[PDB]
């Protein structure tokens, strides 16, 4: 196989760390769209988070960028970030989008399409409401999740529901970056972003960055607790996709994130060290976690040993304590 390809893989592994792996196991024709859907993105999101570009130009770059993809001398060399070489290398990486069959091609164009225009309306703005917070959601995670399932059902490895049902695809990603954005409070904060949705910290604190002061630390373990219990929404559609899927690989590949970020939140649930650090799981839990995420039975008993965990942890003074214990029952039953 191709320099080309062999050149995707290398910055495959050279980005995706641990998931990567998951990745290359994927059956048939899956792998390489993958591969190359999660390279793309990574471009993508690179342009996004460079601050040092300006809005001016970043603006036409995200809604051109769908185009990109079919020029094939296109690169990017003005950017500062840790994946540049994605941006750097764009050609080699377009030209082995141009080579995957076109069904394929046109999924990672459209989602490239959306997500750009989404992504460029919130330059400017912050996260006010719960309800912008899943519209930011859509478009950075909820997005990839439905451009995933169509690949799946178009190559015929998963039934036609699994690409079409947009809202158990976007369940999927915004659980994952939901948990992404609660769990990087302070690594956010210093960075100088915000994406706590002020509808929520506002009714604690004048100031998201308030949080970080010991006197504040009662106010922000309780709005913690509550964009938790925002993220616990999602898991019932979660496990109604999961139990869809009929392909072994494609089922990995979908069940491992998931289970990791519910041992996240479990973990970050009650816990004042979020607000002092990064809360990371033990990598001999995260890969017995890998390990064993491989069926619904078996994916469904962590899933329910983790909201026992965090049913038993929750304190009756909590300010969102019944609406918790409502969703892990439901999660339950
Ligand atoms: C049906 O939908 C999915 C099914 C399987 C996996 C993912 C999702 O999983 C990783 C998992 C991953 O990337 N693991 C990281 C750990 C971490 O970054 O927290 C890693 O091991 O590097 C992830 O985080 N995102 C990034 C977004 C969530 C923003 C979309 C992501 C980026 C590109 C691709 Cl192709 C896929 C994913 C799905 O997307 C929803």
């Known amino acids: 196989l191709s320099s080309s390809l062999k050149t995707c893989y290398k910055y495959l592994n050279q980005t995706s760390r641990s998931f990567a792996a998951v990745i290359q196991a994927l059956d048939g024709e ?6 190359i859907f999660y390279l793309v993105l990574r471009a993508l999101d690179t342009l996004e ?3 040092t570009i300006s809005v001016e130009k970043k603006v036409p770059l995200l809604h051109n960028f769908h185009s990109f993809l079919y020029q094939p001398d296109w690169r990017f060399m003005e950017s500062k970030e840790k994946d540049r070489q994605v941006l750097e290398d764009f050609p080699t990486i377009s030209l082995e989008f141009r080579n995957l069959a076109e069904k394929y091609q046109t999924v990672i164009a459209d989602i490239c399409r959306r ?3 989404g992504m460029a309306e919130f330059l400017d703005k912050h996260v006010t409401s719960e309800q ?3 519209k930011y959601c859509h478009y950075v995670a909820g997005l990839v999740g439905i451009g995933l399932s169509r690949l799946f059902s178009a190559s015929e490895f998963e039934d036609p529901l699994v690409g079409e049902d947009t809202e158990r695809a976007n369940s999927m990603g915004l659980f994952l970056q939901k948990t992404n954005i609660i769990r990087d409070y302070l690594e956010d904060q210093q960075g100088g972003r915000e994406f706590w949705p002020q509808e929520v910290w506002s009714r604690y604190v004048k100031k998201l960055g308030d949080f970080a002061k010991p006197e504040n630390i009662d106010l922000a373990v309780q709005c913690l607790n509550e964009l938790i219990t925002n993220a616990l929404h999602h898991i019932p559609d979660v496990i109604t996709y999961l139990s869809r899927l009929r392909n072994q690989s494609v089922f990995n590949f979908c069940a491992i994130p998931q289970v990791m970020a519910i041992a996240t939140l479990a973990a970050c649930y009650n816990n004042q060290q979020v607000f002092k650090g ?3 799981i033990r990598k001999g839990q995260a890969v017995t976690l890998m390990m064993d995420a ?3 039975p078996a994916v469904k008993a962590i899933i329910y040993q983790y909201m026992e965990e965090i049913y038993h942890r929750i304190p009756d003074s909590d300010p969102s304590s019944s609406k918790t214990r409502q969703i892990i029952s ?3 039953t």
Do not use: L
């Not at 899956?30 to 591969?35: D, G, K």
């Open 30 to 35: 899956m792998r390489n769209a993958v591969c």
């Open 49 to 51: 988070d460079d601050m």
């Open 115 to 117: 997500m750009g225009i």
């Open 132 to 134: 912008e917070w899943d």
């Open 278 to 280: 990064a809360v990371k």
């Open 294 to 296: 491989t069926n619904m």
């Open 330 to 332: 439901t999660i339950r």
